[PDB]
Amino acid sequence: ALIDNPADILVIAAYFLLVIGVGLWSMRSMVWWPVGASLFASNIGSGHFVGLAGTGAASGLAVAGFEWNALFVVLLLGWLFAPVYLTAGVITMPQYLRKRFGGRRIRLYLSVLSLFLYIFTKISVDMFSGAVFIQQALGWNIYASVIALLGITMIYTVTGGLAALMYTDTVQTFVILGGACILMGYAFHEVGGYSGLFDKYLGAATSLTVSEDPAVGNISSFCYRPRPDSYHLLRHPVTGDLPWPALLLGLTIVSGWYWCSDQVIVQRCLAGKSLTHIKAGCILCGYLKLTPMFLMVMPGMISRILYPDEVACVVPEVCRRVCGTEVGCSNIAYPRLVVKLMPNGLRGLMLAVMLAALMSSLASIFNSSSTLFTMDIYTRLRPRAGDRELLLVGRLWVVFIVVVSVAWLPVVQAAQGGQLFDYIQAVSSYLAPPVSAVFVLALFVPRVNEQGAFWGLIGGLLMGLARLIPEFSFGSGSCVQPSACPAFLCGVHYLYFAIVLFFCSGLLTLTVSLCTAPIPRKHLHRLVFSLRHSKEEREDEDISEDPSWARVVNLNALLMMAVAVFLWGFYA
């Protein structure tokens, strides 16, 4: 209804025909700057736009600390974990944990956990973000939007989009980033510049604050006013919506796990020609990860200023009309902006490129999850299976995960008060800390063994499910309509649960390892941090970097850290 003009239609059609044509033509080598660009592109998706703009609208700029935390963990990736992967001779984290502990149940568990994280944090998130963009662009309901998104993704994957991805992934993401720069310019022009945003944001509230529902009635100002600390990164340790101790400590765990264990992130990182190129690309990626504050978060705050009745809706029936869920409509923040600030030419291009990146992400995750299920899960249940059977099983798995993610769509839509980024970060905080703790203990504690690692993973899974399952079964609740969750199971912030779960699963790992047999030295050479410089052979790839460029790249990590530390204190 908004892109229903000749210019937007022409640009969308031309871009989709271009992607189809590039897909039809498609039918350790990288250097530092493609490495950094690829890391940034792999991390940044349309779910990031939706979530970061939505949380900027709902709560202010503290969510920027979610991206700004990533600089230091990307440094951890370049300086600590990429060397571990190269020294071990492995390309994934499951491969490292198979070499480090042996067995086959740790890898099987990690494959199952990765499948669940694909469904929850990747497939349903991308489907929901595409649906939100399509609903804001066309007025369609979320189910029609998701069916159309799946159909265009099917066209895209039957037309060789997987083959064209290896060329166009990073380029497409950075075209999206240029479009986001243009939209940031338009948005800051709408509010009167950078200082206009901070003039206006605290005064931006909806005037529709009374519900016809007798239970709700007049909504309190606390539920519809902007937070008094909206302009602050570091929020109150207990009453803050993003408490600073949580954001500083427990986000490191979850970010650590993302950057240092993600198969795609590590594969992009390990493609560097040398380790110096890997570290320089990590520096570039970290520098790039300061941009979502101004490209997504602040535009979301601007969207709250511009559309307070829609973005900052507070009465449940109004919110249900605005976006489909009664818990709030901050997720429409970035889409609406794209739909209403971009002109008749750039709006269609921005939507088309965002949706094509969506489609690529979906197709990539579909393929990766299907291969993961076929190789790590299905071939264990059926040891010897034919090629045709594996193809059929992969296709049926894609069908199954699509159905499950469509069923999970209302949950993603309503979760965390209708805040997508909080949903992603909460699921990650419930499922990642066990893996982070086990990986850290594997690196730095040689005494940790297969028993300890596996039972730490299982105990962490149980402890994280004891919070995740009640958090989703007690439903979605907002400030207006609080959920019945007993407030010791949901009132602690999910990044505090990240810390607790990390240390409890690590404690379980250590306790089980100490009461079980240890792994002799001969198996651990170049697999634990204590033996990374061990030339001895082991039982069950180049770390060298030129000293001249090693000092150059190290000072550039210090300079990047100082820039990020300035920005943390600037917006504190």
Partner: peptide
């Protein structure tokens, strides 16, 4: 009552002192 740039410079100074400690320890003993 510090300005945002004052807070940024204070954070940078604290970070540089911390890095100076983490380098001087190595300069003394690994």
């Amino acid at each position: 009552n510090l300005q945002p740039w004052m807070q940024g410079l204070i954070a940078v100074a604290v970070f540089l002192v911390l890095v100076a400690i983490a380098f001087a320890v190595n300069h003394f003993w690994c």
